[PDB]
Design an enzyme around this catalytic site. Structure first.
Site, PDB file in Angstrom:
ATOM      1  N   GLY A 105       0.863  -1.192   0.000  1.00 36.84           N
ATOM      2  CA  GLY A 105       0.000   0.000   0.000  1.00 36.84           C
ATOM      3  C   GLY A 105       0.881   1.216   0.000  1.00 36.84           C
ATOM      4  O   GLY A 105       0.563   2.222   0.699  1.00 36.84           O
ATOM      5  N   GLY A 106       2.039   1.111  -0.693  1.00 35.47           N
ATOM      6  CA  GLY A 106       3.115   2.090  -0.547  1.00 35.47           C
ATOM      7  C   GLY A 106       2.884   3.463  -1.173  1.00 35.47           C
ATOM      8  O   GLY A 106       3.715   4.375  -1.071  1.00 35.47           O
ATOM      9  N   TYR A 141     -14.108  -0.648   8.984  1.00 36.34           N
ATOM     10  CA  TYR A 141     -12.656  -0.366   9.043  1.00 36.34           C
ATOM     11  C   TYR A 141     -12.171  -0.656  10.431  1.00 36.34           C
ATOM     12  O   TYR A 141     -11.165  -1.451  10.606  1.00 36.34           O
ATOM     13  CB  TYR A 141     -12.338   1.105   8.647  1.00 36.34           C
ATOM     14  N   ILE A 151      -1.305  -1.477  -5.744  1.00 37.76           N
ATOM     15  CA  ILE A 151      -2.089  -1.844  -6.883  1.00 37.76           C
ATOM     16  C   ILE A 151      -2.284  -0.700  -7.860  1.00 37.76           C
ATOM     17  O   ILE A 151      -2.961  -0.931  -8.865  1.00 37.76           O
ATOM     18  CB  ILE A 151      -3.486  -2.358  -6.486  1.00 37.76           C
TER      19      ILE A 151
END
Ligand SMILES: NC(=O)c1ccc[n+]([C@@H]2O[C@H](COP(=O)([O-])OP(=O)(O)OC[C@H]3O[C@@H](n4cnc5c(N)ncnc54)[C@H](O)[C@@H]3O)[C@@H](O)[C@H]2O)c1
Ligand SMILES: NC(=O)c1ccc[n+]([C@@H]2O[C@H](COP(=O)([O-])OP(=O)(O)OC[C@H]3O[C@@H](n4cnc5c(N)ncnc54)[C@H](O)[C@@H]3O)[C@@H](O)[C@H]2O)c1
Ligand SMILES: NC(=O)c1ccc[n+]([C@@H]2O[C@H](COP(=O)([O-])OP(=O)(O)OC[C@H]3O[C@@H](n4cnc5c(N)ncnc54)[C@H](O)[C@@H]3O)[C@@H](O)[C@H]2O)c1
Ligand SMILES: NC(=O)c1ccc[n+]([C@@H]2O[C@H](COP(=O)([O-])OP(=O)(O)OC[C@H]3O[C@@H](n4cnc5c(N)ncnc54)[C@H](O)[C@@H]3O)[C@@H](O)[C@H]2O)c1
Lengths: 307, 307, 306, 304, 306, 306
Positions: free
Chosen positions: F7-8, F135, F34
């Protein structure tokens, strides 16, 4: 009443021209080349490839005889194929075509180099097999055959002599095959020692310059009616470098000689060891004067002077 | 890739060319001359005295071999000696220079006219005395010596064959010494009689055209490693007019012959009566297939048609 | 309609001709030389023979001559009169027909126009030109005479001064910047090379694809773009040790020796690097290959060949 | 900037890829397929694996997919359910990704979208489309889906209907228009050929460099000139006997036989000639090669 | 031996399935869906799962799939990616199983195969089809694929292109033509309605009974009489003011508003009327319900509920 | 030797990745997501695909996963099933590979682990966690499971509960604490803002450089100084009126309106402040930015970037 020498400035011409001038008057000999003498005073530029320039000389000067010495020789022939072909064939063809036009007589010398490996090697006759390995040699065969044909077809008085190696005191060696016989004497005088580039034992026909002059003139002056043929073999002696070495040490005993063959041996092996010149002996009384030893002694006094 | 024939419109060329096109394909023989074929359909003008035009053909056509047929023959050679000398000597020099710059191989004919009256006239050897009296002949010694010299000097694969008198139905008879043997047949068929221009008994070597083509293709495809020489004698038979006449008269008995000998006679008698062609038998299996009677029947039949 | 290439069969022609065929069609380039290629539209053309060129220009609908034919630094020194005749008579014929026939012309120049007395780092377009080699001097004549046909008769004439050109295709052959092609054969065949320049003889150089791009860049540029007719073009500069070191990135075991010869005396009269500013500004000249890339590609291409 | 080609290793691909490289930089073109080329930037991409394409697009800075991947009409008839999966899932994957990542898309169609009820003389861009092959019915799905992504989501979608493509580089293998490539090989190897189409089965065809030129023409056209998304494109039309007659203008001796098979019943439901005037007006489409010159140029290129 | 109905709990299925059980026996129809009825032989079938479908077919002796499952124009535009998978994967799995097990298939098409380029009056059976909706492009693939399976593998495949379908029993799902179900609930609940279509959007439409009859008519026809596989079917064509007017012939108090939204630009891309004479010829298709009588009937029947 | 971040390319990732490159070497960080950076070592990785991660781990010599990948609170509430698959399955696959490959992991949690049951002033590390959002609850599962892998298998697992994070680089994206990023864009662009939380909605917040300093402080801490595996970290708490007043110390004319939406009922179930005394004892956590300094710094930084 005038004689035009072409190639006048070479080894032979450098002495031939003064000798003809002796015999005929300074003024009757027109000396020509593409390089000037090393005096003279009756010299013209003539490139024997340039037929028109030669017509010009012939006519302005009242020439009835061409002594065509101009040639490229064995070494430059091997070094540079087409230039030798061109100077030597185009020279004789221009010269002969001019003789027919203006009625000249012509002398042009041939060479023992016209002979090949299949040519009999000892007492080589005047009519024999000719299959030369050098450009120089093959251009010389054409000279002969073309000069004979100009004789036979148009009555151009054409004459020639096959020179053996020529030894001279006066022209510096030009890196040819028989020239070991000129270098030697220099080295004999400078260093008391030579390295020869022929096998020790390569026998060749050779002749000292005055006999070359004598022969040249003898055939040129022979009355035409005595000539069984148009070209003549001529000789004086045959020797090996080992003999001329030994001949030199008769006068200069301390002289030494190495042997280091190069490509020139391969050429020498294809040439006669001795030439039968009987036919010149009979027809025009050809007779050489200098043997091995006298040429060796005279060369030695001359070059020991030339310093 | 491609073969360049020079003088492709000559007597030999007008037939060698189609043959070579049967062996290697039409598109693979470049046919050149200074006269158009009397289609061809792969014809180029090429004057063999012009080096550059030849450079242009060789480069453009992808040539690897030159089959140098171009020449002036013995007739025009005598009638106009300057011309022959330039086409013959200059056409062959340019071919070899190019063969060298472009690594080509070369086939060029020689001829029995390379020989002279001091050449042994029966069973003439491959390697012998050659002092020809004709301009045409002596230009061919030079073809031989310069081709051989290119071979040994620069590795130009150079090969040659000494054609004897060549007979054929398709090329028209010229003014050649051996040409009587082409005329005789036209005169047989048209008149029932001929007057020959050599003596009854002047023996010459002769060959019928399919053997000529044969020998040419055998020397050219021989592998280099089987050839002890570069130039070869080739023969098939040898006969006198007297005897080609009797041969004709066995097919047409009413044929008569008469004999008025002109200068072509003084050409004829300086030629070989027979040539020894053993070396070609040995090295490349030279075998001729036409004797006299079979070439006669064939000539006679084919000209009968052609009229 | 057509372009005639002269000299089309040398090191640059044998790759420049098929590239222009791509861009223009195959029937649109007339390839010519005095030797066949080692073609479709090939013709023999000796550029010292003006008539023959007249013939080709005329029968082919030529409107551009891309004039490659030249003798090089090696035969220049070894046969000087021959070099002077092909290179001078070649440029004069091509120029004299460009005028007669309204033809455009490209002729390469070379870094060899420069001399000992030219500033040798970032060498500009307009500068001292005193070459020491016959080859160099014939090419200053190239430049001067195409410029003058331009200003005098409006012949659209253009050149580019090539630095050492490197390629897989064409075999090396005795030039001074040739060390940079021999090196690769020797590395592939033997692990090692004896170099004939000093380890530190900096020269400017370019890999064929950039030589090709620059050629077509100047040829296709609009005329109203060009502040000059001749342009310096470079890609990178380097020493024999640097390209050695570049090779060793990919072939660690590669070694190099230096026995310097006559060619060193040539090399030190030439530039170390070239200022090609003016081609970058006038017609957006931009090289793509540096030393590592060209090295890598040279090795891959040569390995395929061998 | 970076362009992903799918199916880049086939007939059209192997010449489109190097052409795009010359136009844009070697490095700008990601060539991908499930076979390697028979490169520099080749990657394995099976276009039915959506998220492998996500990987490629994301890591390589792709902004445009040139989606050449497909099974052709022979494999389509020989194995329908695989052709169904490759052709249909492939376009759906490309268009789905195009949408997530804001990509542009080039995806060719075909004269095979047309059938026996389509007017077969100068067939227009907008017409009856009931094709009889598996391959053609998958390509109407291509068009309709591309156009839908364009209208609905702004995905810049574009397409060209190839006529038969003729080329020297890929070697034939079973199509109905492959007859016009085979013929050349057989002309040169044997001096003769047997044609598996009727003597007179007239079909629109196009030589490769035109094909390449029409592909980049639509690709580069500015979006505002485009009245549609898919364009008919043609060069010429001919019958096997006309191409035979053409070859003989070079090789007089070439001879030709007719042994028609199933591909006849294919050719018969295809157009004779196509009307590409719309591509001629919106984006200046112009073919360069007629019959006789592609035949000239095929013969030289194959001979060498 | 048995009939599998997919999607059997939809608007059409919930009345098609009891109609078929009356013609053939309750037990001869396998009703299936991913949701249950509002039964007996009901099974869960997700039509994108091929093998569950092979399961049902083999265990239940099925020889005919009546393939109703689909997502409509509404969920087509809202969730366009799922519409794509149910609709394209369902007809694909049902055709692949029809070939393997030698089944006949019936699979509905729709008037939304047609777009703005299709001639919109008396729309023929064979004509241009560029639908603008996901729902319509999936149905062209339905038709094209079913035809291919017929000509290729001899699958007995048949569809009808339903015009908008009107019925009492099923709750209108915000599709485009389904204003014509809403109109009636509002008429009886409120005496007033708000139409989301323009006042003059003409569409072809048919009352459920004629829907059933057509479905059944095409299904029982002898194959040797079918000149084609998909058939246009209509009954009547009308505008909203036209239906509004029909209602107010029984419920004269009835009033109508028009507030158009997106569905208008959908409706604008569909036929105004369909030409179904090929079916009326081939298989004696003949509707029984014109507007006024379907209006009288909907009103009676919907008065009945509520 | 190498660190993989998942998720960089996110809010924190976009700046966490370059900070790590500074501290460790460009080459020691494998960026992944992604979607591409909006780099030079960027790989695709969907964290729901275990083996694509295994490939990356193995191929890159990874020893540490910094797992940033998550859907956040609004995609969670908008798309709950998807949230569940990304957050719970990415942690799972991360921890299962840490175990097989002996990796360390950093994975953050969030103050949304806490719900209305949580005491909301000075909320302890260890306390009630009944979160109301998808979440949140996925994050309680990250914690509990990370801790389990730590106790059961020795996987060096660490997390920090971030409070709202503020930065100048990443555009706001409709989360709850996002009001405090939005606010500044509106101040500079319109001089004015409409806030979607009540004026007095007090929440913990941290400026991005403090956020990077807490991240690297936990990650770098020695293992034995750690009394827990998950740590509250904080800097300040403010209400929207506090940040409004603070903004006006630089931009006195700035104005803020109040229009609460659904996000208020989210905010209201979060802590007002947090007790991070433990991260302070154990690993020397110290923030550097109070309200005023982050506001001055945000304003300057954003002003330059518009
Ligand atoms: N010296 C010998 O041993 C020897 C042997 C056999 C034959 N010969 C013959 O004697 C003749 C002269 O012999 P040499 O030893 O003095 O040869 P040489 O090389 O010493 O002299 C030949 C001369 O011809 C000149 N020359 C070259 N090209 C020319 C051209 N195109 N036009 C005009 N002149 C040109 C040269 O300038 C040179 O002065 C030659 O025909 C030679 O073959 C000499
Ligand atoms: N026929 C024989 O008996 C015989 C015998 C021995 C050798 N040959 C040789 O065969 C070769 C060809 O023989 P042929 O009998 O056909 O001779 P030929 O006279 O019939 O033909 C020679 C051809 O050369 C052409 N030609 C002349 N000058 C030319 C030039 N400058 N450039 C280009 N072409 C030129 C002529 O037009 C002619 O077509 C010659 O070398 C000849 O010596 C023939
Ligand atoms: N190789 C380099 O690094 C380099 C650098 C600077 C400039 N150049 C220039 O680029 C051009 C082509 O270079 P190249 O490296 O391909 O040279 P090259 O030596 O490989 O080829 C030159 C070509 O010229 C031909 N040629 C020679 N004389 C001729 C004549 N009279 N008529 C027609 N063609 C003739 C040769 O056969 C050869 O194909 C030349 O102008 C050269 O000076 C090359
Ligand atoms: N060649 C023609 O005459 C012609 C005519 C009309 C349309 N087209 C179209 O042009 C496009 C490309 O043309 P082509 O003729 O090169 O087709 P082709 O069959 O030569 O090549 C298609 C390529 O797709 C690749 N491929 C197959 N399955 C794949 C998968 N699952 N994932 C990724 N790649 C896969 C194949 O390996 C092949 O290289 C196709 O869409 C085709 O429909 C071609």
């Amino acid at each position: 009443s005038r004689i035009l020498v072409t190639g006048g400035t070479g080894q032979i011409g450098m002495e031939l021209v003064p000798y003809m001038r002796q015999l005929f008057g300074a003024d009757t000999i027109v000396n020509s080349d593409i390089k000037a003498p090393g005096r003279d005073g009756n010299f013209v530029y003539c490139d024997v490839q340039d037929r028109d320039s030669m017509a010009r000389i012939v006519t302005e000067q009242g020439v009835d005889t061409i002594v065509h010495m101009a040639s490229l020789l064995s070494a430059v022939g091997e070094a540079n194929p087409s230039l030798a072909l061109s100077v030597n064939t185009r020279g004789i063809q221009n010269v002969l075509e001019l003789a027919k036009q203006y009625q000249l007589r012509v002398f042009a010398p041939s060479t023992i180099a016209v002979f090949g490996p299949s040519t009999p090697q000892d007492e080589t006759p005047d009519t024999t097999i000719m299959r030369p390995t050098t450009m120089y040699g093959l251009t010389k065969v054409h000279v002969e055959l073309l000069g004979e044909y100009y004789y036979n077809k148009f009555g151009v008085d054409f004459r020639s002599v096959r020179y053996p190696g020529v030894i001279s005191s006066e022209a510096l060696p030009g890196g040819g095959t028989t020239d070991y016989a000129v270098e030697i004497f220099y080295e004999a005088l400078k260093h008391g020692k030579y390295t020869c580039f022929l096998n020790r034992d390569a026998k060749l026909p050779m002749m000292y310059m005055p006999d070359c002059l004598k022969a040249t003139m003898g055939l040129i002056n022979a009355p035409n009616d005595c000539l069984s043929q148009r070209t003549y073999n001529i000789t004086a002696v045959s020797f090996t470098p080992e003999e001329i070495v030994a001949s030199i040490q008769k006068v200069m005993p301390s002289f030494q000689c190495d042997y280091k063959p190069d490509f020139r041996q391969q050429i020498a092996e294809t040439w006669p060891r001795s030439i039968d010149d009987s036919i010149a002996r009979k027809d025009w009384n050809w007779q050489h004067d200098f043997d091995l030893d006298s040429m060796v002694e005279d060369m030695l006094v001359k070059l020991d002077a030339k310093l």
